[PDB]
Design an enzyme around this catalytic site. Structure first.
Site, short mmCIF file in Angstrom:
data_model
loop_
_atom_site.label_atom_id
_atom_site.label_comp_id
_atom_site.label_asym_id
_atom_site.label_seq_id
_atom_site.Cartn_x
_atom_site.Cartn_y
_atom_site.Cartn_z
N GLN A 1 2.45 7.57 0.78
CA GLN A 1 2.20 7.34 2.19
C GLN A 1 2.40 5.88 2.60
O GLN A 1 3.13 5.58 3.55
CB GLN A 1 0.79 7.77 2.54
CG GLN A 1 0.53 7.54 4.01
CD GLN A 1 -0.81 8.09 4.39
OE1 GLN A 1 -1.72 7.33 4.73
NE2 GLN A 1 -0.95 9.41 4.31
N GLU B 1 3.93 15.18 -1.03
CA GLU B 1 3.35 15.98 0.03
C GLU B 1 4.17 15.69 1.28
O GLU B 1 4.70 14.58 1.41
CB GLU B 1 1.86 15.62 0.20
CG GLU B 1 1.15 16.03 1.48
CD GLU B 1 1.02 14.90 2.50
OE1 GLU B 1 0.49 13.82 2.15
OE2 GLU B 1 1.40 15.13 3.67
N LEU C 1 19.13 -10.45 -5.65
CA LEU C 1 17.82 -10.17 -6.23
C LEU C 1 17.55 -11.02 -7.46
O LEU C 1 16.39 -11.35 -7.73
CB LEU C 1 17.71 -8.68 -6.55
CG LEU C 1 17.77 -7.75 -5.34
CD1 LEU C 1 17.86 -6.29 -5.78
CD2 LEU C 1 16.56 -7.95 -4.44
N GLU D 1 18.17 -14.08 -7.80
CA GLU D 1 17.71 -15.40 -7.38
C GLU D 1 16.22 -15.41 -7.09
O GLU D 1 15.58 -16.45 -7.26
CB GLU D 1 18.50 -15.87 -6.15
CG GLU D 1 18.76 -17.37 -6.11
CD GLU D 1 19.58 -17.83 -4.88
OE1 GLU D 1 20.57 -17.14 -4.54
OE2 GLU D 1 19.24 -18.92 -4.31
N1 GTP Z 1 -0.95 -1.23 4.73
C1 GTP Z 1 -0.98 0.10 4.58
N2 GTP Z 1 -1.78 0.69 3.60
C2 GTP Z 1 -1.80 2.04 3.47
C3 GTP Z 1 -1.02 2.84 4.31
N3 GTP Z 1 -1.26 4.13 3.95
C4 GTP Z 1 -2.11 4.16 2.90
N4 GTP Z 1 -2.46 2.88 2.59
C5 GTP Z 1 -3.36 2.45 1.51
O1 GTP Z 1 -2.93 3.01 0.29
C6 GTP Z 1 -4.04 3.43 -0.48
C7 GTP Z 1 -4.03 4.95 -0.50
O2 GTP Z 1 -2.79 5.37 -0.98
P1 GTP Z 1 -1.70 6.35 -0.29
O3 GTP Z 1 -0.38 5.60 -0.17
O4 GTP Z 1 -2.07 6.99 1.04
O5 GTP Z 1 -1.64 7.52 -1.43
P2 GTP Z 1 -0.24 8.21 -1.88
O6 GTP Z 1 0.66 7.19 -2.54
O7 GTP Z 1 0.43 8.89 -0.70
O8 GTP Z 1 -0.67 9.26 -3.04
P3 GTP Z 1 -1.58 10.60 -2.87
O9 GTP Z 1 -2.85 10.20 -3.59
O10 GTP Z 1 -0.86 11.73 -3.58
O11 GTP Z 1 -1.75 11.03 -1.41
C8 GTP Z 1 -5.27 2.93 0.24
O12 GTP Z 1 -5.64 1.67 -0.26
C9 GTP Z 1 -4.78 2.91 1.69
O13 GTP Z 1 -5.48 2.05 2.56
C10 GTP Z 1 -0.22 2.26 5.31
O14 GTP Z 1 0.48 2.96 6.08
N5 GTP Z 1 -0.21 0.88 5.43
MG MG Z 2 -0.28 10.87 0.11
#
Ligand code: GTP
Ligand code: MG
Ligand code: ACP
Ligand code: 7PL
Ligand code: GDP
Ligand code: CA
Ligand code: CA
Ligand code: CA
Ligand code: MG
Ligand code: MG
Lengths: 439, 425, 351, 54
Positions: A11, A71, A252, A254
């Site tokens: 995400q 997902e 990259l 560098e």
């Molecule tokens: N800066 C920023 N942090 C994010 C964002 N989305 C999630 N996070 C952070 O990432 C961590 C959670 O991880 P996710 O990236 O949502 O999890 P995932 O990689 O999708 O893996 P899953 O556990 O399978 O859902 C937490 O510390 C969140 O605050 C975003 O859009 N921007």
């Molecule tokens: Mg996720």
């Protein structure tokens, strides 16, 4: 020209990549349907921007990007959103059920069944490259995908592209924005498995970004949209030298040469100024002196820590806007007599400077004001080890009671991988303290 | 992770489960015939989580209704939303279970269980991405207790990798049908400790006390007790049923709330505590009531234990800044009651759609070591009869051995030890 | 209700500060490792500054300045004075001092130490020196014994000019040193506590036998034991300011403020101003205060010398009450307001 | 303060200012680990179904 492939995982990696590719399009004048009216070589080329975009006969400029998630909902928002025409379906890869904030679930269980499809879609992109340099990988430390699948991917990329460079942009976990107590576990696990496969890693602590958003944008409770538009300005600063004519950090390799003498200490601290609310009624533009000086206030760093109490090994200043070398050297001479900037003895006290004359671009309707000049400092300081100590402490509090371990063992992991990863982190912290502290 | 399958077993299980489907069908705009009728399209972004959509865009609960006698399910079919339910999903026998866990688990219930699993299999097969199961039942009778835990064992065999959640009403001598409820409850807890991911412990004692001391009802019925359970069940599931930033699923909650696999018995709470007033509540008031032991549904003093984890779900339109300040305030003022070895173990969420009749509400899910007090009580009531082997003939006449009682009591006392280990850690 | 933790149990000063915070009924002590504190009374060694200021919703304050050890370690102090332009080699209030590593360790200044040591062999001037490490004290006009004694030890030492002609109090013909307590709050206000103490020798100074180290070492412990006249002139080799002022008035016709204190405030202010950019917590995510003990000596021309800065000072028995109440006043309640004994050091000379 | 390797172009310039001088596992070995964790999953799952079978 040598091409770069961006890999966005999970995400955080996908939403940040969306923010960055939107920014890139604005900066290079690429419209959401992929048309670039100013690119007069229709259907091909090898300008600097082609490091990040390919071209079709119809004149469509296509990101050299793959988005991966276990997902579908976040990447589905990509497939239906403002830049839907920008990407090719095959570059947007989703699973069916995610890693549930579980490193081992993303690495061992669910990773194993999608890794090959991903490497094949990544080779589809490598194949349209005349001379690929390597990879920008965006992910969170804390998610199960971002940690577990990213580390699996990193190992395999070292295998299938062993010569190419690999850069990470990593979101470090902040309790203010996280709904998971196991992020310390995932963070340590993925750092341990990824360390040797990464040439340069830019860490972004969500807590620093959150507080910059509150303090300097007057946003009461920042969302991921606020965080990401700011993070993408910073990423833009860092990659502008790959995407624009210039002579500093043009490939990259560098970034490692300029920022990482010792290959394990490969975590540069980024500092960015000025960050100005777009709603700020009256604003006096900051000079070269003021924004360069702001590069040495902890409140402008991507990771809160205190570089006065470590040592520097490299420093790059990346300016956008109305800046000329004389102003920069005057600002540096002033700052040097007023701040505690100590380098390691086997390194020159000095700064590599890159100036791109175009001022930063801001998303219309975002939170950030247009400014006349801005700067991103990339410094390899030992003070960033503070963020490892924080993380390691949290891991140690939980692991002493084996809290949550069973969720990992039940995925195939062995308990001992926990203490392996933790002891690598202990090695890492001691590395830092050797380079940066006198007896 | 999308569709959830809901099962309700026995008398309490079906009365509370019916109330649950009334409440959430009102939230989602669904009427007692299955036809949508709301305003926000967000009544339907995640409507698939709990409803199957049939032709005519008519919504049918993914609900299996189980009982060993027809009485309560004929009541449900005559009830307010009784027509909502897919008629093939009423699975019942005729003989009853006589408040006897052995008849639910080993004899009567055994005859019935495979036809229940057939309805489950059909509901699962029509699911794009089944994420798991919830069960509503009491632990004090025979059907919801004995057959309910037989089901859970069967579902785990056939779906070992899906999430299993229960909403489990604990017997109390103050609100009591029979003297054998402590036997049934102890036999049931031994099952729950192994085969569920999450158990929401609803003490009938606590519901009674709330109705009496707080709602000012002098003669609480089961109907008033169930109003509080369906309100809590609504709040506990609201994040799964409505779009928000969280994109809530079953597994991430299970993962983040349960640091040790057997310590998954949760203390639920609701605020503001209402009884079917017009005062606006402030966020500071919500937050104090949510953490109040008088708003909690398991009759345990949180001050007698330590919180391992805490989920707080706010509903309605309010300041996120103020919620995060108020949340950070209770932790930083009462920090001894949260275990220091799980950093940042209080997480909070907000759903913008409030429940019916309130503009602001909060739901509390607590994994506290004080839930051990619940299992001590049951164990004292159990041992008080078992040392004289009283009322056992009702169980040995169904095939059970005294040894099976001694094992279940030992397992429950182990679980009490486990909790006491982390209260001192 | 503010919350605090204590992590140094061997601290008389902050033991008393702890008790005083409790007895206000608006401060609660937590467990040594509960992170949810407003205040950390921290350990002397390996205090974890990098874990402070990351607790959302908690303003955090600690009683130590990360980096102040550059002032509170003998070799650090010498390096800081000789390499900081605003102190400089031309520093008139610090004794000539050279950093010396043992031979088992081999940077080092034995090179430049003998170069000036010869100009006192050549120049007929008093070539006595003292050697000390951050027990283990040697005073001798022969450099060959100094450097031999340092190599016989394992850690870095500093060779420092020994002040052979100190102001000696009568009746006694006897040594002393002055101890000042300085509180630096989170705003970097520098607060000198109005009460100092003279750590006195009760043996007549004797410049002929520099090995009899009881009229030469005014340390309160060496005088509690190895000294036979402990308690003669003042209770416990401790003269306070009201008396020392009166003695100076009667013996020398001057005051404590004019003859000594102006120089002490100049020295304190200069040292703390020097390292201010390195240690200030103005724009940091956590905040520091710290209590320092400054140790001074007075020669016969009423010139003040800085001897050593102590980052973890004990206070004097009768003063504990007043000082620890003052720490709570200006260092803690300034940051955490509930429901002067100090002089503020500040000076803005325009040029 | 020495300024060095100054490059200029239409879009900007770059340089270096000096203030002071100096005072992997294989595809097979990955596939094995991913399969040694899947066997541990299959074991744990069998031990559960054996327990459910008792
Ligand atoms: N800066 C920023 N942090 C994010 C964002 N989305 C999630 N996070 C952070 O990432 C961590 C959670 O991880 P996710 O990236 O949502 O999890 P995932 O990689 O999708 O893996 P899953 O556990 O399978 O859902 C937490 O510390 C969140 O605050 C975003 O859009 N921007
Ligand atoms: Mg996720
Ligand atoms: N250059 C010097 N010349 C003359 N006397 C000196 C001297 N340096 C130290 N002394 C004497 O030794 C004592 C100070 O010793 P030192 O500076 O090593 O303190 P210390 O660290 O051992 C104990 P504390 O830290 O509490 O003061 C003083 O009392 C002083 O009389
Ligand atoms: O499960 C059920 N309700 C439910 C309620 C809230 C959230 C979720 N699902 C999640 C939780 C999550 N993290 C998380 C971890 C701890 C606390 C919290 C919270 F709630 F406090 F914010 C969130 N991440 C993704 N999804 C599910 C009922 C039994 C059927
Ligand atoms: N809260 C609540 N508890 C109930 C209800 N009906 C029965 N109980 C309790 O449930 C237990 C009896 O179980 P019951 O469900 O009637 O037996 P079953 O039909 O064999 O499952 C006793 O502890 C009763 O107090 C109800 O509607 N609500
Ligand atoms: Ca072109
Ligand atoms: Ca490599
Ligand atoms: Ca029968
Ligand atoms: Mg009944
Ligand atoms: Mg069958």
């Amino acid at each position: 020209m040598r091409e770069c492939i961006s890999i966005h995982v999970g995400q955080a990696g996908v939403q940040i990549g969306n923010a960055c590719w939107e920014l890139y399009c604005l900066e290079h004048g690429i419209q959401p349907d992929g048309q670039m009216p100013s690119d007069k070589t229709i259907g091909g080329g090898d300008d600097s921007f082609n490091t990040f975009f390919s071209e079709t006969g119809a004149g469509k400029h296509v990101p050299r990007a793959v988005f991966v998630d276990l997902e579908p909902t976040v990447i589905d928002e990509v497939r239906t959103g403002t830049y839907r025409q920008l990407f090719h379906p095959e570059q947007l890869i989703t699973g069916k059920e995610d890693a549930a904030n579980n490193y081992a679930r993303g690495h061992y269980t669910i990773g194993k069944e999608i890794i090959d499809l991903v490497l094949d879609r990544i080779r589809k992109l490598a194949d349209q490259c005349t001379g690929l340099q390597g990879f920008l990988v965006f992910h969170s430390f804390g998610g199960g995908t971002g940690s577990g699948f990213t580390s699996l991917l990193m190992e395999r990329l070292s295998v299938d592209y062993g010569k190419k460079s690999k850069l990470e942009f990593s979101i470090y976990p902040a309790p203010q924005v996280s709904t998971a107590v196991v992020e310390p576990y995932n963070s340590i696990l993925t750092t341990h498995t990824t360390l040797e496969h990464s040439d340069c890693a830019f860490m972004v602590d969500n807590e620093a970004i959150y507080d910059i958003c509150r303090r300097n944008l007057d946003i009461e409770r920042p969302t991921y949209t606020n965080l990401n538009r700011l993070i993408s300005q910073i990423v833009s600063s860092i990659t502008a030298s790959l995407r624009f004519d210039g002579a500093l950090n043009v490939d990259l390799t560098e970034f490692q040469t300029n920022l990482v003498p010792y290959p394990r200490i490969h975590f540069p601290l980024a500092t960015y100024a000025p960050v100005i609310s777009a709603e700020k009624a009256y604003h006096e533009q900051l000079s070269v002196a003021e924004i360069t000086n702001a590069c040495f206030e902890p409140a402008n760093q991507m990771v809160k820590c205190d570089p006065r109490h470590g040592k520097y090994m490299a420093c790059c200043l990346l300016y956008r806007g109305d800046v000329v070398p004389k102003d920069v050297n005057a600002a540096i001479a002033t700052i040097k007599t007023k701040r505690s900037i100590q380098f390691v003895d086997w390194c020159p006290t000095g700064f590599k400077v890159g100036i791109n004359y175009q001022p930063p671009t801001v998303v219309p309707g975002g939170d950030l004001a247009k400014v006349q000049r801005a700067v991103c400092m990339l410094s390899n300081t030992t003070a960033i080890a503070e963020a490892w100590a924080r993380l390691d402490h949290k891991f140690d509090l939980m692991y002493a009671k084996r809290a949550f371990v069973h969720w990992y063992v039940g995925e195939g992991m062995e308990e001992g991988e926990f203490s392996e990863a933790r002891e690598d982190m202990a090695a890492l912290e001691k590395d830092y303290e050797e380079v940066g502290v006198d007896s | 992770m999308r569709e959830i399958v809901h099962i309700q077993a026995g008398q309490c299980g079906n009365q509370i489960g019916a109330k649950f489907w009334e409440v959430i069908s009102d939230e989602h705009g669904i009427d007692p015939t299955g036809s949508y009728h709301g305003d926000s399209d967000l009544q339907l972004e995640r409507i698939n989580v709990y409803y199957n959509e049939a032709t005519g865009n008519k919504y049918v609960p993914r609900a299996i209704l189980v009982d060993l006698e027809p009485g309560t399910m004929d009541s449900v079919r005559s009830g307010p939303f009784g027509q909502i339910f897919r008629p093939d999903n009423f699975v019942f026998g005729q003989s009853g279970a006589g408040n006897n866990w052995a008849k639910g688990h080993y004899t009567e219930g055994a005859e019935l269980v495979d036809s229940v699993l057939d309805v489950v299999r059909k509901e699962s097969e029509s699911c794009d991405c089944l994420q798991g199961f919830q069960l509503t039942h009491s632990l004090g009778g025979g059907t919801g207790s004995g057959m309910g835990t037989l089901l859970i064992s069967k579902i785990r065999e056939e779906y070992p990798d899906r999430i299993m959640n229960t909403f489990s009403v604990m017997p109390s001598p103050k609100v009591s049908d029979t003297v054998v409820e402590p036997y049934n409850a102890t036999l049931s807890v031994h099952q729950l400790v192994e085969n569920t991911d999450e158990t929401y412990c609803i003490d009938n004692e606590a519901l009674y006390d709330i109705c009496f001391r707080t709602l000012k009802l002098t003669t609480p019925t089961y109907g008033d007790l169930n109003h509080l359970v369906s309100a809590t069940m609504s709040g506990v599931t609201t994040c799964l049923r409505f779009p928000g930033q969280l994109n809530a699923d079953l597994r991430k909650l299970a993962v983040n709330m349960v640091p040790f696999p057997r310590l998954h018995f949760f203390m639920p709470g609701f605020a503001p505590l209402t009884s079917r007033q017009y005062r606006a509540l402030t966020v500071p008031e919500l937050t104090q009531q949510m953490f109040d032991s008088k708003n909690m549904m398991a009759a345990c003093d949180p001050r007698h234990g330590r919180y391992l984890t805490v989920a707080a779900i706010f509903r309605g339109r309010m300041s996120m800044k103020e919620v995060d300040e108020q949340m950070l305030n209770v932790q930083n003022k009462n920090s001894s009651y949260f275990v220091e070895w799980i950093p940042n173990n209080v997480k909070t969420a907000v759903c913008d759609i409030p429940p019916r009749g309130l503009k602001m509400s909060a739901t509390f899910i607590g994994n506290s070591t004080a839930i051990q007090e619940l299992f001590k009580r049951i164990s004292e009531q159990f041992t008080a009869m078992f040392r004289r082997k009283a009322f056992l003939h009702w169980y040995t006449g169904e095939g059970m051995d005294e040894m099976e009682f001694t094992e279940a009591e030992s397992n429950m006392n182990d679980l009490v030890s486990e909790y006491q280990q982390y209260q001192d850690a | 209700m503010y919350t605090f933790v204590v992590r140094d149990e061997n601290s008389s000063v902050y033991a008393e500060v702890s008790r005083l915070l409790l007895a206000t009924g608006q401060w609660k002590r937590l467990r040594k490792d509960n992170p949810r504190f407003n205040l950390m009374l921290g350990e002397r060694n390996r205090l974890p500054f990098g874990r402070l200021g990351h607790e959302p919703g908690l303003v955090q304050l600690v009683n130590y300045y990360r980096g102040a050890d550059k002032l509170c370690r003998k070799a650090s102090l010498v390096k800081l004075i000789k390499t900081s332009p605003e102190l400089s080699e031309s520093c008139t209030w610090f004794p000539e001092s050279y950093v010396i590593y043992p031979t088992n360790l081999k940077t080092d200044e034995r090179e430049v130490f003998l170069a000036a040591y010869n100009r006192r062999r050549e120049g007929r001037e008093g070539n006595v020196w003292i050697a000390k490490s951050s027990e283990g004290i040697l005073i001798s006009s022969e450099a060959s014994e100094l450097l031999d004694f340092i190599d016989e030890q394992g850690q870095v030492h500093v060779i420092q000019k020994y002040l052979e002609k100190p102001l000696l109090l009568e009746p006694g013909h006897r040594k002393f040193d002055i101890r000042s307590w300085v509180l630096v709050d989170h705003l970097y206000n520098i607060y000198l506590y109005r009460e100092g103490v003279l750590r006195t020798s009760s043996e007549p100074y004797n410049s002929a036998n520099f090995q009899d180290k009881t009229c030469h070492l005014t340390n309160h412990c060496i005088q509690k034991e190895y000294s036979k006249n402990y308690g003669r002139y003042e209770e416990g080799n401790e003269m306070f300011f009201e008396e020392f002022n009166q003695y100076l008035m009667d013996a020398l016709n001057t005051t404590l403020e004019n003859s000594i204190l102006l120089q002490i405030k100049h020295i304190i202010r200069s040292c703390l101003m020097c390292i201010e950019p390195a240690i200030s917590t103005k724009h940091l995510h956590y905040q520091s205060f710290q209590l320092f003990g400054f140790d001074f000596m007075v020669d016969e021309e009423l010139k003040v010398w800085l001897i050593e800065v102590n980052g973890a000072p004990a206070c004097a028995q009768k003063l504990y009450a007043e000082l620890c109440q003052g720490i709570v006043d200006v260092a803690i309640s300034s940051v955490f307001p509930l429901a002067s004994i100090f002089i503020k050091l500040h000076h803005h000379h325009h040029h | 303060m020495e300024v060095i390797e100054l490059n200029k172009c239409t879009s900007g310039q770059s340089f270096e200012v000096i203030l002071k001088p100096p005072s992997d596992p294989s595809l097979e070995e990955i596939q094995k680990k991913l399969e040694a964790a899947e066997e541990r999953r299959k074991y744990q799952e069998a031990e559960l179904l054996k327990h459910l079978a008792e």
